[PDB]
Design a protein around this ligand. Structure first.
Ligand SMILES: Cc1cc2nc3c(=O)[nH]c(=O)nc-3n(C[C@H](O)[C@H](O)[C@H](O)COP(=O)(O)OP(=O)(O)OC[C@H]3O[C@@H](n4cnc5c(N)ncnc54)[C@H](O)[C@@H]3O)c2cc1C
Ligand SMILES: Cc1c2c(c(O)c3c(O)cccc13)C(=O)[C@]1(O)C(=O)C(C(N)=O)=C(O)[C@@H](N(C)C)[C@@H]1C2
Length: 371
């Protein structure tokens, strides 16, 4: 009854925002999602996602999509390999435990979430740029100059969100590591040496402070990521330009001098690199207790954390599960009370996940790390 005659808008059609939309919409709520992506066919860059049984799968199960997720997800083994190509350990998948945390492509996950929403729930090509209160309505202004209204706004537009101020003045901060991600489409044909090395499993390798991760089977593409402590020089004078593939390739081949040629072939065969400093949106400071109208944040917009403990999406899907339940479960007598309890709970499991992810980051990028 809290949401009677309330227009609820979600900013961002990521995994967290769409799951939130599904959880509210299946209860009869009036939901609109504004997404900056041009249209539903836009590719989502990055690796696969694993939904954990305790958190991410609960959100999907609660939304009625758990089996759809299982149908599209792939169980993946993991090989720990040294820099010379020697497999050190092989953690294969139990057929019994294959539904524990199978990997799903990001576009496939988005498609299942979109198909569970009513038609035209997501409004595409809508980049929110301004959010201001007008009496009892939020005013949403978009990059294309259009404007919309809402009674409740849920910020779900990712870790670099610029529309958080009414909730918190906390700024995104850097942790000291750097990630370079890339895709090699049709790896059986285009990087056969490294594809053979993965041998149907995800690959993980650490050497000289440089970590390499690879998934050979991300919907017919090999996705891999290279992570390291950000060089101290890049803070004063950096010489790698990430708009120039050739400069990125040159830098990586220097870093990977001692690695087996199959790794260097992987680097030389990459057409585009995405480089980004690891960031955190810290939960050290409490959010604002005085807000002009109901608003909150979920997902990376709430607790962006380093992606070294596999907590990112699962923490966000927990946000959507707890917040959607609080708004519909009859336990609270105001939207604001329901939001406040959500944030109390989220600061608790959010703070723990961030502390874990920082612990893993510090350990993994020490020169003594060995998996
Ligand atoms: C390199 C890397 C690897 C990772 N690996 C994993 C992993 O293996 N497992 C895992 O669980 N997590 C992983 N994560 C973290 C995980 O991807 C995030 O926690 C998760 O994607 C957060 O989802 P979200 O919906 O909150 O935000 P996002 O996934 O960023 O989605 C936000 C959405 O909002 C849209 N948007 C942004 N600004 C606007 C705007 N102004 N107006 C409208 N729409 C807007 C974006 O286009 C996007 O669709 C990784 C992160 C990184 C950087
Ligand atoms: C360290 C780690 C990683 C991942 C991960 O899921 C995870 C976990 O679930 C528990 C503990 C540790 C990790 C990744 O999935 C992954 O996203 C990944 O597979 C990966 C990749 N396939 O390229 C990465 O790039 C890695 N990172 C730099 C973002 C990260 C590494």
């Amino acid at each position: 009854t809290l949401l009677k005659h309330k227009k609820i808008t979600i900013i961002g059609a990521g995994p967290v925002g769409l799951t939130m939309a599904r959880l509210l919409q299946q209860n009869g709520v009036d939901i609109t999602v504004y997404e900056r992506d041009k249209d539903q066919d836009a590719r989502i860059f990055g690796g696969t996602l694993d939904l954990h049984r305790d958190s991410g799968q609960e959100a999907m199960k609660r939304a009625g999509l758990l089996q759809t997720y299982y149908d599209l997800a792939l169980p993946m083994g993991v090989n720990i390999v040294d820099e010379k190509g020697n497999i050190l350990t092989t953690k294969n998948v139990r057929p019994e435990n294959r539904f524990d945390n199978p990997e799903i492509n990001r576009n496939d996950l988005r498609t299942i979430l979109l198909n569970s929403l009513q038609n035209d729930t997501v409004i595409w090509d809508r980049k929110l740029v301004t959010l201001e209160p007008d009496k009892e309505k939020w005013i949403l202004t978009f990059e294309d100059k259009s404007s919309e209204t809402a009674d409740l706004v849920i910020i779900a537009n990712g870790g670099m969100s610029k529309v958080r101020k009414f909730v918190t003045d906390t700024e995104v901060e850097e942790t000291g590591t750097f990630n370079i991600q890339a895709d090699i489409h049709q790896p059986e044909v285009n990087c056969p040496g490294f594809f053979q090395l993965c041998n149907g499993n995800r690959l993980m390798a650490a050497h000289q402070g440089n970590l390499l991760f690879a998934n050979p089977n991300n919907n017919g593409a090999l996705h891999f990521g290279i992570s390291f402590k950000t060089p101290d020089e890049w803070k004063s004078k950096t010489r790698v330009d990430f708009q120039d593939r050739n400069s990125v390739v040159d830098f990586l081949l220097k870093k990977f001098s001692d690695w087996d040629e199959r790794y260097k072939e992987l680097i030389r065969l990459t057409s585009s690199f995405v480089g980004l400093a690891t960031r955190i949106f810290p939960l050290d400071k409490s959010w604002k207790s005085k807000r002009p109208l109901p608003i909150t944040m979920i997902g990376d917009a709430a607790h962006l954390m380093p992606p070294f403990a596999g907590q990112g999406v699962n923490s966000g899907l927990m946000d959507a599960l707890i917040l959607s339940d609080n708004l519909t479960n009859g336990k609270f007598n105001s939207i604001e009370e329901a939001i406040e309890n959500y944030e109390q709970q989220m600061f608790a499991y959010g703070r723990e996940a961030q502390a874990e992810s920082i612990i893993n980051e510090t350990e993994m990028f020490s020169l003594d790390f060995s998996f």
